[PDB]
Design a binder for this molecule. Structure first.
Ligand SMILES: CC(C)CNC(=O)c1nccn1C
Ligand SMILES: CC(C)CNC(=O)c1nccn1C
Lengths: 265, 264
């Protein structure tokens, strides 16, 4: 991987592995989500981040994902090379946005795109705080000044409000627990695990007959290493749509909400 | 990746990813096990296997792992390149062996080694069969003739008999279920998932203060997509543990193993 000529974005090629593909011999949405995370970390590394700034480490501040939105047109096949370009942009004091474009390395065609909203939080108290001016300037030199959006469309699906699923859910997968492979280097549950847990309540018949086109996920609260999760799905719709909810198995405390859009094979 | 000059082994370089490392910023044993699987599949692909031969497909025969043994000296750090060399050898009618050598791409030093025993099974009836002779010859041309062992030392850990853990276990992790990410392209539970499930019953105190040096795992039965698993561990000792994976209901055995850990 390498920063582009202008130094304002990062590109990386990946060869799709055998264990990274599903029944269609193409990469799963969790494999894609892992590759976006990987290219995102390599971009921060390439511009001097061990992605916390000098001031953030001092104040015990971290960047946390609030929303993730992925749209896939063609999932890469096992053995294919996928090129991913990523960049960040500040969206005022609300936080930052990280965008990705996935391309077929051979043809150059856009096979997918993604966007994410990040907010500043104290690692210890978990309290959100707006981006201070001194923090903002530290990372403005690594972002393009003019707007550059993976989702520029007038009324695009990446900014739609997500409602709360009402009980009874149509489908459910109960008692989901993270294992050590689900934890990152800081022993927190990886953001990608929640995508897999959302998809666990989709019936196998939808998975076998449809392709996942769009997934939007809101992150409300993190699942601890010793927490148990319940995954809920209700159909909201030639295309299938679902409303999703992740909540703590005990008191029913919300951890995530989302929607998926599937198209017939 | 590419076959070596003699065409009798395969090499591949891998850069360790951010999500592939644990709390020590080094690759987990499941990441290593995934890379061995990846280099093993790329080797079969490079020699014409689209690793069943054309005769095996006609008979509905597959290769199944019976035993896995991994020894790690140094886990690669996040961002490092690891070079893995793999090869196969026939071990008579019992089955085939696949071996691996892991090296630091920068220094050339051996950082780990692995071995696995594979047996021929009918995919439908699940009945174990000898490799026959017409099937033998089809893949003998891709293996070295003289012995080439990742574990040559007479009386080594990779061939030691594994006993069955007696109840009550010292530690346990119950109700383990596979999710879709745990399944391979054929909707079977990936053989790497069982390693993660074995390690789930090791106390976090051992993981935080020790490094996993050796792991030997016997595969007795596959866990179905809708099965629930119980993971059991008892200390037998450096720390040593005896492991057992069994079906959450009737207690039907799926795996047995041992681990060896060294103080950091
Ligand atoms: C939004 C989910 C899929 C996580 N993806 C990321 O972008 C990420 N997580 C940690 C560091 N990065 C770059
Ligand atoms: C590495 C351990 C978990 C065993 N897995 C493999 O080697 C394998 N599975 C399918 C194809 N290969 C080469």
């Amino acid at each position: 991987g390498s920063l582009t000529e202008d130094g304002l974005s990062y590109k990386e090629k990946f060869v799709v592995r055998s264990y990274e593909v599903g029944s269609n011999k193409t990469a799963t949405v969790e494999t894609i989500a892992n590759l976006l995370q990987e290219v995102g970390c390599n971009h921060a590394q390439s511009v001097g981040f061990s992605a916390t700034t000098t001031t953030m480490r001092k104040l015990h501040l971290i960047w946390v994902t609030a929303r993730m939105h992925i749209e896939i047109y063609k999932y890469p096949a096992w053995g294919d090379v996928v090129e991913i370009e990523t960049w960040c942009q500040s969206e005022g004091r609300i936080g930052t946005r990280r965008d990705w474009i996935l391309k077929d390395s051979v043809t150059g065609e856009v096979t997918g795109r993604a966007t994410s909203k990040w907010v500043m939080m104290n690692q210890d108290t978990r309290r959100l705080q707006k981006v201070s001016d001194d923090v903002r300037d530290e990372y403005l030199v690594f972002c393009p000044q003019e707007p550059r959006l993976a989702f520029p469309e007038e009324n695009n699906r990446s900014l739609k409000k997500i409602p709360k699923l009402e009980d009874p859910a149509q489908y459910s997968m109960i008692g989901l627990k993270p294992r050590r492979a689900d934890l990152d280097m800081n022993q927190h549950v990886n953001n990608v695990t929640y995508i897999g847990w959302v998809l666990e309540s989709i019936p196998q018949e939808i998975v076998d007959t449809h392709e996942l086109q769009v997934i939007t996920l809101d992150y409300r609260r993190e699942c601890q290493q010793d927490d148990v999760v319940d995954s809920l799905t209700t159909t909201t719709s030639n295309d299938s749509q679902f409303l999703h909810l992740l909540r703590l198995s005990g008191d029913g405390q919300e951890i995530n909400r989302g929607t998926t859009l599937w198209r017939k094979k």
